[PDB]
Design an enzyme around this catalytic site. Structure first.
Site, PDB file in Angstrom:
ATOM      1  N   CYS A  40       0.782  -1.220   0.000  1.00 49.74           N
ATOM      2  CA  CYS A  40       0.000   0.000   0.000  1.00 49.74           C
ATOM      3  C   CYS A  40       0.830   1.294   0.000  1.00 49.74           C
ATOM      4  O   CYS A  40       1.601   1.548   0.915  1.00 49.74           O
ATOM      5  CB  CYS A  40      -0.984   0.004   1.165  1.00 49.74           C
ATOM      6  SG  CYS A  40      -2.102   1.406   1.087  1.00 49.74           S
ATOM      7  N   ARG A  96      -0.320   4.559   2.845  1.00 47.67           N
ATOM      8  CA  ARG A  96      -0.299   4.317   4.288  1.00 47.67           C
ATOM      9  C   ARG A  96       0.050   5.526   5.158  1.00 47.67           C
ATOM     10  O   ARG A  96       0.011   5.424   6.382  1.00 47.67           O
ATOM     11  CB  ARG A  96       0.636   3.160   4.638  1.00 47.67           C
ATOM     12  CG  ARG A  96       0.210   1.811   4.122  1.00 47.67           C
ATOM     13  CD  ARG A  96       1.212   0.751   4.547  1.00 47.67           C
ATOM     14  NE  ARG A  96       2.262   0.532   3.564  1.00 47.67           N
ATOM     15  CZ  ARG A  96       3.372  -0.157   3.818  1.00 47.67           C
ATOM     16  NH1 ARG A  96       3.563  -0.668   5.031  1.00 47.67           N
ATOM     17  NH2 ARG A  96       4.284  -0.343   2.862  1.00 47.67           N
ATOM     18  N   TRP A 110      -9.192   6.177  -1.273  1.00 44.88           N
ATOM     19  CA  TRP A 110      -9.421   6.903  -2.506  1.00 44.88           C
ATOM     20  C   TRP A 110      -8.420   6.416  -3.537  1.00 44.88           C
ATOM     21  O   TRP A 110      -7.403   5.829  -3.196  1.00 44.88           O
ATOM     22  CB  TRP A 110      -9.351   8.424  -2.288  1.00 44.88           C
ATOM     23  CG  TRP A 110      -8.156   8.870  -1.526  1.00 44.88           C
ATOM     24  CD1 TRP A 110      -6.881   8.969  -1.994  1.00 44.88           C
ATOM     25  CD2 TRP A 110      -8.115   9.296  -0.160  1.00 44.88           C
ATOM     26  NE1 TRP A 110      -6.047   9.421  -1.003  1.00 44.88           N
ATOM     27  CE2 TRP A 110      -6.782   9.635   0.132  1.00 44.88           C
ATOM     28  CE3 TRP A 110      -9.080   9.435   0.843  1.00 44.88           C
ATOM     29  CZ2 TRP A 110      -6.385  10.083   1.384  1.00 44.88           C
ATOM     30  CZ3 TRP A 110      -8.686   9.889   2.082  1.00 44.88           C
ATOM     31  CH2 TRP A 110      -7.353  10.206   2.345  1.00 44.88           C
ATOM     32  N   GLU A 124      -4.061   3.925 -11.081  1.00 50.04           N
ATOM     33  CA  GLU A 124      -4.895   2.716 -10.988  1.00 50.04           C
ATOM     34  C   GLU A 124      -5.951   2.700 -12.058  1.00 50.04           C
ATOM     35  O   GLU A 124      -6.154   1.674 -12.723  1.00 50.04           O
ATOM     36  CB  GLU A 124      -5.580   2.608  -9.634  1.00 50.04           C
ATOM     37  CG  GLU A 124      -4.618   2.540  -8.485  1.00 50.04           C
ATOM     38  CD  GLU A 124      -5.332   2.408  -7.170  1.00 50.04           C
ATOM     39  OE1 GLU A 124      -5.907   1.329  -6.932  1.00 50.04           O
ATOM     40  OE2 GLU A 124      -5.328   3.385  -6.386  1.00 50.04           O
TER      41      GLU A 124
END
Ligand code: HEM
Ligand code: HEM
Ligand SMILES: N#Cc1ccc(CCNCc2ccc3ccc(N)nc3c2)cc1
Ligand SMILES: N#Cc1ccc(CCNCc2ccc3ccc(N)nc3c2)cc1
Ligand SMILES: C[C@H](O)[C@H](O)[C@H]1CNc2nc(N)[nH]c(=O)c2N1
Ligand SMILES: C[C@H](O)[C@H](O)[C@H]1CNc2nc(N)[nH]c(=O)c2N1
Ligand SMILES: [Zn+2]
EC number: 1.14.13.39
Lengths: 406, 404
Positions: B108, B111, B280, B285
């Protein structure tokens, strides 16, 4: 099912298994507890040597389909007796050729391995001086450059010898631009080369003050200090960078050299160590367009080009970095093409490496590949290797990193 | 032992000692590195050990270790496992655990936000219908009219010899992928299997590229149930380029809320098989993976032709050019629609800051380099030039088999 790494391509859905990894003798940096795969540089007894030598001789006879033969068993007795009397042994010419090619083929970080079979091997194990190393090198550069129609080559100098000094090329590449630390803290030229520049100076090179000054070579024959050799300019082919539609780009006065010739890597074959064995190929465009020209800690020209393009550099979300980076890569490609100098873009390269992986799947049951180094530094998921799972491990023969001579 | 971690852009060196708190194996061994694999290949003293460790973590987190409350909680947990073979978490512990799981997630890039997570306890759920109600609330909250907020909703834990609560959908908002028998796919190809499951369970399909799927929710040992999300709950952003007026004509859109619903949440040995969470999007992506990936909507060539580029050859970097405009289009659109989003430059910049906070806080930070570096402009971001150590800390989000 199979007791081997299951490997997946997520674009195509295809599965393979790597059985080749079971041939690896050397541990890498990873453990069940942590993966250290992203580290760039993670941290003989006759018994040891012989086992390595035997293994390599078996690889060799295997490649010529004579595993088990009388010539194969004889060669083993020969190597063993040789070590038994001298502590070391020597390779036959075709063994050196096969090993050099196999070290390339085994190089997990190299995306150019589709070419591994076409490698010209120059034997220079007769070399006995630093002046002689210079001649070999010059010859290599001449042959490998070939007026812009580039040709993969390697030149192998004498192996490490018990109680005797190494043959070392001090520079990391045969061609390198100088890095001049300025009085205002900054660096003129290539910041990557500040240390090798200062070493050339301490050794009596009269230094320039350009952004693109070709460094002299520091060549080191056994048990002697390095001598300094200046490459004749016509031997060093360079490409001026223009852009195909941004007319001002030529005015930036940027250039790069045609030949990527790595010269500080140790070539290991059957426990034999070749401390000086420079090799060369051709560039993939992002090496120049992205790493060398746009790394913050390199030429760092991203802002410059972005300004000239009139981009909004005050905010990340304009993607001005991405925009400028493309146009720099495009200019690298366009200029090399125009100059008729061999070059490959990162799409064409990664496509060709997918074909390599498929060749080796059949040939050897797998291919050791470093995903972080195989994926290009721009447009990553646009190339097919991004979607290819890879298994990474050390095979030998091998190109290994070695500490700096000084 | 302890790894030397180097940043190659700045010359700075750290030492990860947080890795030594890893109690779980990864895919690698000294012989070969398997870091690039996406998925993993495959008594009661065990549970009690993981249980104590987590409690220990919890009471240290609130600076109350060795206290009476800490000592009592350990006996409670110990007494409950001894007698029932399992135990339960207090809500405050759960809130802690869920945050630590996000914080420990090596893949991730977002974070920096870990301590800011709204936790909805839904462990008192007893049916698909109730699961649906909890999901709608999560979506309403998290979406927040475009000012996205990070939330997790936690459904009842797995129990010995009983089916799991599951959300069959991988995300709470997916677009239908309809397999046209002529090889091709209409819609998102990543969602062919799930779209079929929906139809065989009675959903009336559409024939569009961006048809929002219904949810299949499964209460334990029962057939899954079909639930259509109220259109007003699924916020979406129509994509248009800031200067290429022809881009909007492509009829491209993406949803605002990335809510992942098929991962398992493990806290103190307990396992939560349905715990959808959301934050979000990072622009790449949508712009790079979802819209440009060959096995997805795969719009690269289309855009490239409307930009009048040379498809004939790779050396023209037409792919790279089209991709940059698609990512620009997404960032522009979201910002125009006042929906939260982070570009890959801002995101990795905050991740660096995060690694630093973490180095000071725990003596390291588990990170998956291949997953932290964005899908375009890799080296143009600071995280490319940073070495990372990867390992498994608990609490942790895990993958789990599809429940069919
Ligand atoms: C023929 C054209 C070639 C191409 C396009 C090519 C491409 C590349 C690229 C792009 C890298 C990444 C290096 C970096 O980013 O620093 C690499 C690595 C490497 N290449 Fe190749 N290469 C070629 C030929 C060769 C040859 C002829 C050899 C040796 C016989 C070789 C051996 C290696 C090795 C050992 C690495 C690992 C780099 C390292 O560990 O520092 N390559 N190659
Ligand atoms: C707040 C803004 C957030 C951003 C921008 C963000 C960004 C990302 C991105 C870009 C990925 C890579 C995913 C992929 O490419 O497939 C990822 C992975 C991941 N994220 Fe975050 N994230 C955010 C919040 C959260 C939250 C709230 C959670 C959970 C509570 C979370 C947990 C995870 C996990 C477990 C992964 C691993 C993905 C997998 O392996 O399936 N993130 N994140
Ligand atoms: N310290 C350090 C350190 C610095 C750079 C590298 C990577 C250097 N790789 C250079 C390299 C090596 C071989 C190549 C072969 C072909 C090619 N086109 N580029 C090539 C580029 C590793 C360690
Ligand atoms: N099989 C499989 C398989 C396929 C894809 C993935 C990747 C899924 N990760 C998606 C994901 C997960 C969490 C996220 C959190 C935030 C965010 N913005 N995107 C996020 C995106 C994993 C397993
Ligand atoms: C920190 C990170 O490992 C490092 O920057 C790596 C990443 N991938 C790379 N890939 C290539 N081809 N060359 C490199 O030098 C690197 N550097
Ligand atoms: C096989 C390879 O590891 C795989 O494609 C990974 C690489 N890095 C990734 N990184 C992110 N953020 N998301 C991904 O899906 C992937 N996929
Ligand atoms: Zn590893």
């Amino acid at each position: 099912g199979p007791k081997f790494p299951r490997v997946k391509n997520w674009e195509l859905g295809s599965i393979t298994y790597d059985t080749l990894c079971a041939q690896s003798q050397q541990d890498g940096p990873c453990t069940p507890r942590r993966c250290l795969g992203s580290l760039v540089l993670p941290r003989p007894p006759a018994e040891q040597l012989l086992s390595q030598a035997r293994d390599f001789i078996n690889q060799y006879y295997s490649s010529i389909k004579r595993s088990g033969s009388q010539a194969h068993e004889e060669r083993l007795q020969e190597v063993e007796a040789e070590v038994a009397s001298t502590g070391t042994y020597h390779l036959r010419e075709s063994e050196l050729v096969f090993g050099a090619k196999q070290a390339w083929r085994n190089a997990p970080r190299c995306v150019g391995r589709i070419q591994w079979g076409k490698l010209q091997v120059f034997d220079a194990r007769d070399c006995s001086s630093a002046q002689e190393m210079f001649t070999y090198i010059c010859n290599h550069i001449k042959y490998a450059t070939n007026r812009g129609n580039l040709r993969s080559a390697i030149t192998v100098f004498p192996q490490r010898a018990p109680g005797r000094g190494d043959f070392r090329i001090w520079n990391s590449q045969l061609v390198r631009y100088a890095g001049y630390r300025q009085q205002d803290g900054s660096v003129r030229g290539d910041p990557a080369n500040v240390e090798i520049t200062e070493l050339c100076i301490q050794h009596g090179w009269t230094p320039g003050n350009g952004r693109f000054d070709v460094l002299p070579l520091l060549l080191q024959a056994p048990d002697e200090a390095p001598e300094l050799f200046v490459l004749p300019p016509e031997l060093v082919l360079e490409v001026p960078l223009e852009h195909p539609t941004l007319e001002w780009f030529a005015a930036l006065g940027l250039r790069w050299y045609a030949l990527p010739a790595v010269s500080n890597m140790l070539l290991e074959i059957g426990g034999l160590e070749f401390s000086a064995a420079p090799f060369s190929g051709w560039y993939m465009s992002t090496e120049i367009g992205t790493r060398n020209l746009c790394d913050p800690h390199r030429y760092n020209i991203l802002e410059d080009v972005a300004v000239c393009m009139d981009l909004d550099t005050r905010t990340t979300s304009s993607l001005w970095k991405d925009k400028a980076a493309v146009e720099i890569n495009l200019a690298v490609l366009h200029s090399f093409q125009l100059a008729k100098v061999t070059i490959v873009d990162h799409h064409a390269a990664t496509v060709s490496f997918m074909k390599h992986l498929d060749n080796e799947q059949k040939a050897r049951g797998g291919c050791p590949a470093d995903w972080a180094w195989i994926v290009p530094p721009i447009s990553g998921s646009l190339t097919p290797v991004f979607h290819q799972e890879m298994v990474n491990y050390i095979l030998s023969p091998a190109f290994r990193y070695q500490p700096d001579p000084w």
